[model samples]
Target: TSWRSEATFQFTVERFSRLSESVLSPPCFVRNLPWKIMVMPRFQKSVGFFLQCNAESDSTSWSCHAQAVLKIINYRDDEKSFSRRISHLFFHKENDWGFSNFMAWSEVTDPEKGFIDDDKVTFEVFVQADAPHGVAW
Candidate 1:
């Protein structure tokens, strides 16, 4: 609980409606740890945005505490960016935490929503976490 860092990652897609598998952003560092955001488009009726702690360790007993904001930035206005907040415990078996159904495609694709721009959909996550058990030394 001594260090705090935040990372923001952006992912753009050419077609939001055609996505069938999970997509993730490049690894970003927070509290000297690798963190990435994975989106499961249409995994359910809505989309799921997950915060994944991608730290690789020989020890599977390590754990971490991370809080983050999953956001879909509004293309037109920063003030209109829709977001969700979460605080989670990360273990080797359960390293993902976020909304299973964050938003509906209809809401995201609506002309008034501004979530999509020029056929590109942008998704991002901002993480705040302290040093993990493995990195505290």
Candidate 2:
């Protein structure tokens, strides 16, 4: 199957106050490829977010030249919304990319910060991959 030009995925975590260490989203697809989002809520009192491409087969090599952006929807304050953008080649050998400190836990947990609403937090990812046709050479 041909790959789509772009794809978006949303990851939501419930019961934020009860979170232990981290949460991972179910696999999502982009360009017929699988991907997932991971969030670490206890990384030095700050939230860490990551994007990973899952390995489907050992012999099937894959590479994605894409730009990825993570957005934290601010339910309380627009100014408190967080976003991180990264551009890289996601290869089968090294398929993970993310921010070590995407947002402060204190701010995210605070009711006033707007990151958490109804004991839930949501994250969105937008991925735009370069055309695969040009890379076939």
Candidate 3:
């Protein structure tokens, strides 16, 4: 399928508690992208990172990667359902499936509580031609 026909990109948001062994470290934050990171019919895959434990004030910063491609099927003006859908997707179970495994890097937290100003988090990802893919785990 053509990239345009494959799937629509959607922004999936999640939170993680601060924990050790983090490559990017705690207080991860993400912002600014080609598109808004929200759940919608057009959104296919969204990504981000989180810590393993509740971080101390000084250890609030975090960083990670996210990427997704969407195939727009329908659009709506009512932002209520769209927002709820995004919330549903974010809160969706982190099973071992496409895009779900991305949250395995840290202990999963509530997506509703997203990031806060005091979290000091940073979000980053690369949507390149050579991004990694999985066969089976």
Pairwise TM-score winner, candidates 1 and 2:
1
Pairs clashing in candidate 1?
A: none
Clashes of each: 0, 0, 34
Q: Compared to the true structure, candidate 2 yields what TM-score?
A: 0.82
Q: What is candidate 3's lDDT per residue for 46-107, written digit by digit as tens?
A: 22332111122232233212333321111221221211111111111221012222332222
Listed in order, each prediction's TM-score against the native is 0.85, 0.82, 0.19
User: Residue 2 lDDT in model 2?
Assistant: 35
Better of 1 and 3 by lDDT: 1
- What TM-score does prediction 3 earn? 0.19
lDDT of each: 0.77, 0.77, 0.24
Model 1 stretches with alpha carbons more than 4 Å out: 1-4, 55-58, 135-137
Lowest-sum lDDT 10-residue window in model 2: 128-137
Sort by TM-score, best first: what order? 1, 2, 3
The most accurate candidate by TM-score is 1
